[PDB]
Design a protein around this motif. Structure first.
Motif, short mmCIF file in Angstrom:
data_model
loop_
_atom_site.label_atom_id
_atom_site.label_comp_id
_atom_site.label_asym_id
_atom_site.label_seq_id
_atom_site.Cartn_x
_atom_site.Cartn_y
_atom_site.Cartn_z
N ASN A 70 32.50 211.10 44.29
CA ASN A 70 31.05 209.86 44.93
C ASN A 70 31.77 208.40 45.21
O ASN A 70 32.51 208.53 44.73
N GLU A 71 30.74 207.58 45.34
CA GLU A 71 31.01 206.58 45.58
C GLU A 71 31.45 206.30 44.17
O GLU A 71 32.67 205.09 44.18
N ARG A 72 30.74 206.14 43.46
CA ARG A 72 30.62 205.58 42.52
C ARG A 72 32.43 205.87 41.72
O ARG A 72 33.18 205.53 40.49
N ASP A 73 32.67 207.52 41.43
CA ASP A 73 33.84 207.85 40.94
C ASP A 73 35.04 207.06 42.04
O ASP A 73 36.43 206.72 40.90
N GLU A 75 35.25 203.93 43.72
CA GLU A 75 35.22 202.42 42.88
C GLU A 75 35.56 202.51 41.29
O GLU A 75 36.04 201.70 41.17
N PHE A 76 35.50 203.07 40.24
CA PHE A 76 35.76 203.31 39.26
C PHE A 76 37.10 204.40 39.19
O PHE A 76 38.02 203.34 38.62
N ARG A 175 32.53 202.42 30.75
CA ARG A 175 31.87 203.06 31.61
C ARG A 175 30.22 202.05 31.74
O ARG A 175 29.00 202.03 32.42
#
Ligand code: ATP
Ligand code: MG
Ligand code: MG
Lengths: 582, 240, 113, 120
Positions: A70-73, A75-76, A175
């Motif tokens: 996903n987007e969070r993965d 970006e991290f 995180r």
């Protein structure tokens, strides 16, 4: 030379040895960025690199992200990869990188990192058979099946690469409490470029001391008037002190006690005689012996380095320290001073630590009572001293200090100063207390004073202001000195306004100097601090321009001025970046 | 009037100022020099205006009969009033004359000064005081000769002047006679001084701004406008 | 805007990816807006369509500019006009190149004194 | 060192003092004159010792283009400090430059001056 290699590997890990063997010349450091997935096989690369212990190798794992979903993965992962790239980058070299490993998202993020931070040569590797073992790839490269593709050559943004100083104080980007500061970097650059390209009034210019890449929030913070709580930031800011007397350092306290072994915020006007008597415990009566003089020099250099001062000019009286009885001539005293300063500078530089370059100014002491040949002797001594040539520390100027009254104006010895001007030696005047505009005028135009001392009353002489501004000659305005002696607002009985603000508006190259740290009890940092209430409405941008004026006024060669400008720009950018976040 | 009418329509206008030439032994008696200085100071005393008189100029033929160390006493008053002096200390002028121009006339600029490379002390003081050195590439190339001139060995010293740190500025002298404006004057540097860089040209423009006789506020406005325009031109330059 | 499209099952038939987007399986990944360089496109004016061409007329116009980016102190911090720092790096290294005769257009567009 | 070594053994020793020649250097980056004057002044100011610097000498390129009527203003510091002045002039120069050297530089010695007999 450290040909550092950075790579990312997914299901296939043997590509990194292929990247290493792509260039037969051989690398020195190789690092691989990989997630915490269980499909990785680090043992093959570990045993391959163990066969060449002379090449450094390390493995970094991105915890918590098995794969980008996903987007969070994503970006991290991008934040972690950017942090790793900017933390494993060579200090003074652009590293190499191969994009072949990893899936498309890692490849794109790695190329983006290479574009932002720069790389010596980005390249690819192509395997016809896609080997899984060292032996098969070795046979393929021996035959010629190995293929390396190189397409890019990126300098990157130097401003972005100078950001690694903010990496610590994050615990490792957990995180739960992670702030993607590299995303802050990318938003800073994007906002700066977009604002520059979407306006003209803002896009005029603004910062002359040079930077213009700070985040817009940082620029707004800079434009705001400076407060009394900016002490930590300004102490972290490097400074320049063009007017400091050696003989007035250990005038009292444990410093005086220890140099003998081997206030500071007043609100009443003090006469010059009392100020001179405050330092009577040191100087002529004390520094005749070699040990006390050496201790004074070492202590002064240590204090200057402690105060983050990156350059200073020191005025010392060799004749006041000479001792003919002990065969200690003035020339010998000056030679000792130069030698100990050179030794300290070399010692500080050889350890690759911050150091304070220091040059001496021979002060042509004013007597006007007896032995008037002393001025000519001082001039000859200064000329011969500057004729040394070699040495990081040297003689660059002569100070015309003393009682600046009408009895010793500049219409006395100009024919003598022809000699010092002939040999390419700078002259600093001092006509700032109890003087008429005429005296300042022919001190500028007959003594050819390339720099001027004090001169607090230029406001009432517009012709003098035009002359000083047009000729770009400096002003050695000392805040604490006139605070103690003359006094200004907002002290009681002192309603006079400090002309420093108006001097800055007019355009005079004002340099704030500490005069005597020991006698005044306040250093250059406190000298800059006192402007918060001395001149209301003063902003940090004016402080930066003051530093720029100081570095632009000092008597230095063009090449050394260029080096100092480079170092000061880099350090100011770094300290501003550090301070804006905290 | 031209500047005001160009600015009223909000177009590109060239702000311009005048320099009063005070020639030496050009028309007869040397009292013409005093007359020129008096006229220049009286003109600057106008007070209000847009196109003002920045300062005076000192020009002569070659040397000796037109030396720069003759009129200090005459120059005292005019230089005291607040004007500026740009002595033509150059073009086969001995270093002593340049020294007198710098240190007794307080000249803020030197014309040409091509042979400054043979006076290390004079160089050192020039860079130490940031004295502008106006140089005309095409004019000096035509009247003196520099590589790649046929049957010539000497080469233009501008590159070394910039490396040393002299506040060098590139000019045009006489447009009609030399047949070259500022654009081709700067362009010829590629084949006159090999290895010259574009950032060096930008620094030349910056130095030209630096050595001009203007007020501080006007200098700041000019610098801001020049910087914005420079950014736009280098943005749209790599297009071609 | 440059971005990426990721699919968990990598659909082949159109109805499959349609059904995937109905739920939201296809995610959208972008690294941000890219200003590029504000002006580089006169390459397409100077270089025509060239529909009839081959490997012989290969144009390395920018590659030598890319090669001379770092292959080549005064030239480093002689930077005037502080807004030149905001200028993108490729044109910065372009400025670091030596002057040439064919820069007459830039010289004429150059504001001078 | 040589004088002290000769004197310790009670032999005959020649006392020797140095004269700082200020070479004319017709153009020669003429600041060397000021450099020489400053060097001589500080060398005398060193003070302690047996052999000492007593004065300066100006000579070289004796033609009228390098006469003694040029540097009469630079010799104020050297002469106030305490040095002595010598001026070599007169081998083939005019009988007025000698007067300038005597009454302007305050020279206490005149090198050569073989043509003095024609200026009573
Ligand atoms: N002219 C100079 N004056 C003072 N320091 C200098 C000068 N030239 C080089 N240096 C030193 O070079 C060193 C280079 O350090 P570097 O670029 O690696 O940044 P850093 O080590 O992370 O932080 P810092 O700059 O404080 O050392 C600096 O420490 C600086 O003190
Ligand atoms: Mg002082
Ligand atoms: Mg002319």
């Amino acid at each position: 030379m450290s040909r550092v290699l950075l790579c990312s590997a997914g299901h296939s890990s043997m590509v990194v040895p292929e990247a290493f063997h792509a260039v037969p010349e051989g690398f020195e450091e190789v690092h691989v960025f990989t997630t915490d997935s269980e499909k990785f096989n680090p043992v093959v690369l570990n045993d391959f690199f163990h066969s060449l212990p002379n090449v450094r190798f390390s493995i970094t794992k991105c915890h918590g992200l098995a794969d980008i979903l996903n987007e969070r993965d994503f970006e991290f992962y991008q934040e972690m990869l950017w942090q790793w790239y900017l933390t494993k980058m060579p200090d003074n070299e652009l590293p190499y990188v191969c994009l072949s490993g990893g899936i498309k998202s890692m490849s794109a993020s790695l190329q983006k990192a290479a574009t932002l931070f720069g790389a010596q040569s980005v390249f690819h590797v192509l395997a016809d058979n896609n080997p899984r073992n060292i032996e098969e790839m070795f046979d393929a490269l021996q035959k010629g099946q190995i293929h390396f593709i190189e397409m890019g050559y990126e300098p990157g943004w130097a401003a972005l690469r100078r950001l690694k100083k903010i990496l610590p104080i994050n615990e490792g980007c957990s995180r739960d409490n992670f702030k993607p500061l590299i995303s802050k970097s990318i938003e800073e650059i994007l906002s700066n470029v977009k604002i520059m390209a979407s306006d003209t009034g803002k896009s005029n210019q603004l910062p002359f001391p040079s930077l213009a890449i700070l985040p817009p929030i940082a620029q707004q913070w800079l434009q705001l008037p400076l407060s009394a709580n900016d002490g930590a930031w300004i102490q972290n800011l490097p400074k320049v002190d063009l007017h400091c007397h050696l003989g007035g350092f250990a005038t009292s306290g444990s410093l005086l006690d220890q140099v003998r072994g081997a206030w500071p915020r007043s609100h009443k006007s003090i006469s010059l005689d009392k100020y001179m008597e405050l330092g009577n415990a040191n100087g002529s009566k004390l520094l005749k012996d070699k040990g006390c003089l050496i201790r004074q020099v070492e202590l002064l250099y240590q204090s200057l380095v402690n105060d983050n001062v990156a350059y200073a000019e020191i005025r010392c009286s060799p004749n006041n320290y000479a001792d003919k009885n002990k065969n200690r001539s003035a020339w010998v005293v000056l030679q000792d001073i130069n030698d100990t300063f050179t030794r300290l500078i070399t010692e500080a530089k050889q350890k690759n630590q911050f150091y304070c370059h220091v040059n001496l100014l021979v002060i042509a002491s004013r007597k006007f009572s007896g032995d008037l040949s002393d001025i000519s002797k001082h001039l000859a001594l200064a000329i011969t001293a500057m004729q040394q040539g070699e040495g990081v520390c040297r003689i660059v100027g002569v100070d015309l200090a003393g009682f600046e009254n009408k009895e010793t104006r500049a219409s006395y010895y100009e024919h003598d100063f022809k000699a010092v001007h002939r040999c390419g030696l700078a002259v600093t005047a001092h006509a700032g207390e109890n003087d008429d505009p005429e005296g300042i005028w022919q001190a500028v135009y007959s003594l050819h004073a390339r720099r001027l001392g004090h001169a607090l009353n230029l406001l009432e002489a517009p012709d003098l202001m035009r002359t000083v501004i047009e000729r770009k000659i400096g002003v050695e305005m000392c805040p604490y000195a006139n605070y103690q002696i003359k006094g200004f607002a907002p002290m009681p009985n002192f309603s006079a306004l400090y002309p420093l603000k108006k001097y800055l508006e007019a355009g005079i190259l004002v340099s704030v100097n500490t005069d005597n740290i020991g006698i005044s009890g306040a250093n250059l940092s406190e000298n800059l601090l006192i402007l918060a209430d001395l001149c209301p409405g003063i902003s940090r941008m004016d402080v930066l321009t003051i530093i720029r004026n100081s570095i632009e006024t000092a008597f230095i060669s063009h090449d050394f001025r260029m080096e100092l400008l480079k170092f000061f720009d880099r350090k100011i950018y770094d300290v501003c970046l550090i301070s804006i976040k905290n």
